[PDB]
Design an enzyme around this catalytic site. Structure first.
Site, PDB file in Angstrom:
ATOM      1  N   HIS A 108      -3.672   5.984   3.639  1.00  0.00           N
ATOM      2  CA  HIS A 108      -4.449   4.828   3.191  1.00  0.00           C
ATOM      3  C   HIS A 108      -3.859   3.534   3.718  1.00  0.00           C
ATOM      4  CE1 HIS A 108      -5.755   1.960  -0.004  1.00  0.00           C
ATOM      5  NE2 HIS A 108      -6.843   2.688  -0.056  1.00  0.00           N
ATOM      6  N   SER A 138     -11.071  -1.208  -0.511  1.00  0.00           N
ATOM      7  CA  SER A 138      -9.828  -1.156   0.219  1.00  0.00           C
ATOM      8  C   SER A 138      -9.968  -1.380   1.698  1.00  0.00           C
ATOM      9  CB  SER A 138      -9.141   0.193   0.034  1.00  0.00           C
ATOM     10  OG  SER A 138      -8.635   0.341  -1.269  1.00  0.00           O
ATOM     11  N   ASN A 150     -13.895  -0.299  -6.900  1.00  0.00           N
ATOM     12  CA  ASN A 150     -14.913   0.623  -6.432  1.00  0.00           C
ATOM     13  C   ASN A 150     -15.675   1.302  -7.560  1.00  0.00           C
ATOM     14  OD1 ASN A 150     -13.874   0.190  -3.795  1.00  0.00           O
ATOM     15  ND2 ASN A 150     -12.301   1.644  -4.322  1.00  0.00           N
ATOM     16  N   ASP A 175       0.848  -1.197   0.000  1.00  0.00           N
ATOM     17  CA  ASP A 175       0.000   0.000   0.000  1.00  0.00           C
ATOM     18  C   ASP A 175       0.881   1.243   0.000  1.00  0.00           C
ATOM     19  OD1 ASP A 175      -3.327  -0.037   0.792  1.00  0.00           O
ATOM     20  OD2 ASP A 175      -2.270   1.879   0.876  1.00  0.00           O
TER      21      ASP A 175
END
Ligand SMILES: [Ca+2]
Length: 279
Positions: A69, A224, A161, A39
């Site tokens: 994130h 996520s 998404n 990430d």
């Protein structure tokens, strides 16, 4: 063990029904497992990680998570208050820049890194990788995810998404990994969640409270956020000896809450990650 007033998603993965508040889990809590969070990095100094997080690799100038994130996702895997597997070891692999973006070649390299690096790590209960990332279809990205899984790592990836079929997204569309869609606290498919035959499982993904950079916390939404619930669940179940890296996705599907979710299209599993914890 029971965590009262837990984030809804943690409560959800320990209940057959929506609307509860207490996260029930075995106290082993993923001890002896390891989860690589591939990430933007992990702010390992966050008190919520309790010294159990470390950066192991960066593809950028710094290993610092300058975004948040990756810290958020890592918190859902394994932070004290916000994590599924509260005693796991977290390893950060920074393949995404501080805007949350990354090139596929870099993402691929980070997957291959994990497949190798896990041989330098003591992870007696096994190894998981959480990939809250991806874009459009790439056979090379899918192959990298397949390699990481084949190497003996439980790979969990976000479905994406786009409110679209995950067949067109990578590494979501790699069949051999665990592709994770998102739900909300009312057991709806999250508005944005991808769907399709390649999904293996859903996890909580709308309005997920976790760690953030600067020693902070916030709630955000995405596949996520669902992904690290499943990665953490895998780690937890591997520590309990119930499953293995090769079989954990299938085990999670076997043991999921079935048929609870609304707005699941035709051809998509109606399966919500569940720990089946029985005190
Ligand atoms: Ca799969």
């Amino acid at each position: 063990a029971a965590q009262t007033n837990a984030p809804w998603g943690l409560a959800r993965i320990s209940s057959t029904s929506p609307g509860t508040s207490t996260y029930y889990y075995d106290e082993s809590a993923g001890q002896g497992s390891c989860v690589y969070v591939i990430d933007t990095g992990i702010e390992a100094s966050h008190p919520e990680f309790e010294g159990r997080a470390q950066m192991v690799k960066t593809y950028y100038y710094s290993s610092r998570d300058g975004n948040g994130h990756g810290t958020h996702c890592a918190g859902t895997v394994g932070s004290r208050t916000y994590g599924v597997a509260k005693k796991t070891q977290l390893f950060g692999v920074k393949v995404l820049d501080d805007n949350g973006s990354g090139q596929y070649s870099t993402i691929i390299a980070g997957m291959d890194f994990v497949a190798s690096d896990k041989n330098n790590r003591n992870c007696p209960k096994g190894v998981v990788a959480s990939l809250s990332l991806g874009g459009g279809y790439s056979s090379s990205v899918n192959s990298a995810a397949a390699r990481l899984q084949s190497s003996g790592v439980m790979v969990a990836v976000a479905a994406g998404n786009n409110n679209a079929d995950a067949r067109n997204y990578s590494p979501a569309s790699e069949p051999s990994v665990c592709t994770v869609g998102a739900s909300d606290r009312y057991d709806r498919r999250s508005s944005f969640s991808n769907y399709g035959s390649v999904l293996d499982i859903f996890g909580p993904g709308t309005d997920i409270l976790s760690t953030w950079i600067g020693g902070s916390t916030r709630s955000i939404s995405g596949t996520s956020m669902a992904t690290p619930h499943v990665a953490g669940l895998a780690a937890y179940l591997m520590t309990l000896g119930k499953t293995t890296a090769a079989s954990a996705c299938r085990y999670i599907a076997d043991t999921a809450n079935k048929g609870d979710l609304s707005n699941i299209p035709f051809g998509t599993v109606n399966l919500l990650a569940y720990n089946n914890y029985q005190a």
